[PDB]
Amino acid sequence: VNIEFEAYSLSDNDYDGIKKLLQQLFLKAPVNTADVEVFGFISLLNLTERKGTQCVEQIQELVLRFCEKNCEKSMVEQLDKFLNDTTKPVGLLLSERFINVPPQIALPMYQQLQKELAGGKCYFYLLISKTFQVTALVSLKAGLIQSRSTLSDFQGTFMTVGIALS
Amino acid sequence: VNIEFEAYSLSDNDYDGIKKLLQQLFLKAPVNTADVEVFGFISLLNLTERKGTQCVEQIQELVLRFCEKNCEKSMVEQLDKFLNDTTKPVGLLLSERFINVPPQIALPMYQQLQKELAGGKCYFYLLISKTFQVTALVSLKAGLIQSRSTLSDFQGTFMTVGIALS
Amino acid sequence: VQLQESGGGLVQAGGSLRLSCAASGTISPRGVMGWYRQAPGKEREFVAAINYGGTTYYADSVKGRFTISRDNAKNTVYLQMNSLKPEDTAVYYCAVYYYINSQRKVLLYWGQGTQVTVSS
Amino acid sequence: VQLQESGGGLVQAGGSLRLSCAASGTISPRGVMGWYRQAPGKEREFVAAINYGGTTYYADSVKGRFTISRDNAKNTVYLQMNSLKPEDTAVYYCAVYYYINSQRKVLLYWGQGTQVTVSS
Known part of the structure; x- marks a missing residue:
């Protein structure tokens, strides 16, 4: 099982909205030191x-719907449900056991x-990124992969990890 | 990983105590129809x-302690902690998602x-049995095995299933 | 809205059956009526469907053997099943559904199904 | 009860060190003092132990090279380490424990450890 999505076609305020979306997600969990x-998260x-x-099923359905x-513009609203809907698997998995790691971890x-x-x-990632001042490129990568350990054993199953790099 | 214990050396009231122990376990969960x-349980x-x-770790430690x-006589008290201690993995796993199936299922x-x-x-079983009136034999089998499906897909992980046959 | 299947039964291989599914109420012109089958120990699979305007769809397994038709005045869908094979043995269910868009199907109603048995 | 390790350091292979672990309080006569080591990215393993009566235990990896001893008046355990190998590079921790019975060990106190580095 592999599911990999990349979009380089975002607007500055699409990026800027999703960043806010991820930020509430951060504030909404335990913060670690x-x-x-x-910006984004990596969930085992x-x-x-x-x-x-x-x-x-939800992830695959979101990606299918992103291929419309x-x-x-809908990206920002569709992500709002996706990750903030606790009545749903992915929005529920991100309310429980979401941990915010400092950047040296991230x-x-x-x-x-x-x-x-x-x-x-099986890792689940959603990851936006900006390269500048100006904006040179904006990228939303998001996918489901099976691989080698990214967590340092510091992560458990259905534990999610926050990324926030500046 | 394999862990298999059998004891044919029980007293009629050791059997009779453990049966009561399992019975509270039954009454303490959702009953199905x-x-x-x-008598006993099979936990995935x-x-x-x-x-x-x-x-x-708990199961292996109980079995190690049964090899004293x-x-x-301690069997009945040691089982009392084992499965009724919710401050413990096994006593906790039997309070959540314990389901009581009718005998045609069991x-x-x-x-x-x-x-x-x-x-x-990986299946976890604890199973007492009497063969009679008189008592001809009493047996406590209890073990950790890895095998082919016993559940009929009707069971999930950390779902436990009640056995009660008469 | 209730869907009532009928016309199931036992038949020999190479034989024919005609299933019928009547709806207790008026099906919207957006409503597609479909047949689905479930063999013992299998999932429920698509067999055939027909929209209100008479456009038909078939699974590859039944193409050229089965014929779906619809009577809008009777709120009834029919499945003529010819050249029956042992693999056509299943419970056959009718359902009413509509498309919201090209990707989103809403299943509204399921019937209780009818048994078809094809003996060798 | 605090345990204070000392005598760690850098030494060449084939060389020797003497670790010491002092307890801030009186250790019960039931108390066994043991040394444990933890190499980088490894679990903490047993090295040697000594009971109050002077009975000694050693891991096979250090047998014939290391010598544990205890001073009951100073509440201090010593580990003489001879013929040091690169694989003896670890943080060395002392601990106090006792046996309740033949199967049950209770670890009571751990020290903070001392670094031993054996250079080639």
Whole structure:
């Protein structure tokens, strides 16, 4: 099972709305302590579970719906339901066990996801990114992959991890 | 991973106490509807989880403690903690998602466990049995096995199933 | 809206049956009526469907053997089943559904189904 | 009860170190003092232990190279480490524990550990 989506066609305020969407997600969970922009989350999943596969139906359906023709302004509203609907698997999985790691944790996890994506643990990622001042490029990557450990054993199943890089 | 325990050395009131212990367990959960004695439960487990392996530590420790020399009257008290301690993985797993199936469901599941034990899904079973009037034999079998489906897809992970055959 | 299936039964291989599904109420002109089958221990699969305007759809497994038709005045859909095979043995259910758009189907009503058995 | 490790450091392979672990309070005569080591990215493993009566225990990896001893008047345990190998590089922790019975060990106190580095 693989599901990989990338969009380079976003508007500055589409990026800017989704960033706010992710930010509430951050503020809404436990916070932890002990150029380019990147924001999003990396959630570990178990596909032998009901939750695991119930999520995937939602994720796959969102991606299917993102493959609509004029489906671009809608991105920001469709993401609003997706991740903020607790009446739903993905919005529910992000209210429970969402942890906010500081950037020194986050960068290694981004970079390894970025390696693993380029070339057994089901990971769910949603990741926006801006490269500048001006804006040179805006990118929403979001996918379901099975790979090598990105978590440092510091993460459990249905544990989600916050990315926030500036 | 395999863990299999059988004891044919029980007293009539050791059997009779454990039966009461299992019975409260039955009364304490949702009840479902749509010669020899056998009583116990069959609980499906996922070993890639924390819960799954936290249970096994308890199960393995109970079995280790059952391999003590004079450890027979203690069986009834040690089982009392084991399965009724919600401050503990196994006593907690039996308070959540314990389902009581009628005997027409239960017998097929016993019989298949009895086949699979004789000769990938981690199952946890605890099973007492009397063969008579008089008492000819009393048996406490209890183990951790990985096998073929005993549940009829009617069971989920960390779902436990009641056995009660008369 | 209730859907009432009928015309199931036992038949020999190569034989024919005619299933009927009557609706207790008026089906919207947006309503598609479809037949689905469920073999023992299998999921429910699509067999054939017909829209209000008479456009027909068939599964590849029944194409050239089965013929769906609809009577709008009787609120009834028919499935003529010819050249029956042992693999056509299933419970056959009718359903009413409509499309919101090209990607979104809403199933509204299911019938209770009718048994078809094809003996060798 | 605090346990204070000392005598860690850098040494060449084949060399020797003497670790010491002092307890801030009186250890019960039922108390066993043990050394444990944790290499980078590894679990904490047993090295050696000594009971109040001077009975010694060693891991097979250090047998014939290391010698544990205890001073009951100073509440101090020593680990003489001879013929050091690169694989002896770890943080070394002392602990106080006792046996309730033949199967049940209770760990009471852990020290903060001392670094040992064995260079090639």
